[PDB]
Design a protein around this ligand. Structure first.
Ligand SMILES: N[C@@H](CCC(=O)N[C@@H](CS)C(=O)NCC(=O)O)C(=O)O
Length: 109
């Protein structure tokens, strides 16, 4: 399907992806967590309240990840969870490890 192809191609073609809705505070929280390490222009935020086929994309996200809710965050193709999860991973060091492994974050000393 178009929705499946969109999601698969997006997460395999972009290192940091957040499927989002503009109005959702969990999406905002996930974005702010990622922005501690990366600029906005390196975060691929797909707004499913803007896309006409947003519901179809959420349906595929249920198939791929186990849930439909936004956000759904992917690092180098790996689903890492929603907004609370992404914020927790930012705080606990694991997000940085994933971003460095993905080649989009340098060590800074
Ligand atoms: N605890 C979840 C909450 C996510 C959530 O429930 N988001 C709402 C929007 S505030 C949602 O997806 N609603 C259903 C929908 O938009 O389909 C997280 O951390 O991401």
């Amino acid at each position: 399907s178009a929705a499946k192809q969109l999601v698969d191609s997006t997460i395999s073609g972009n290192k940091v992806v957040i499927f989002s809705k503009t109005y959702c505070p969990y999406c905002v929280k996930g974005k702010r967590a990622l922005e501690k390490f990366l600029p906005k222009s390196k975060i691929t935020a797909i707004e499913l309240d803007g896309r006409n086929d947003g519901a179809a994309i959420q349906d595929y996200l249920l198939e791929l990840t186990g849930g439909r809710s936004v956000p759904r965050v992917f690092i180098d193709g790996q689903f890492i969870g929603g907004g609370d999860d992404t914020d927790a991973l930012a705080r606990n060091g694991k997000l940085e490890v994933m971003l460095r492994n993905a080649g989009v974050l340098l060590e800074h000393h």
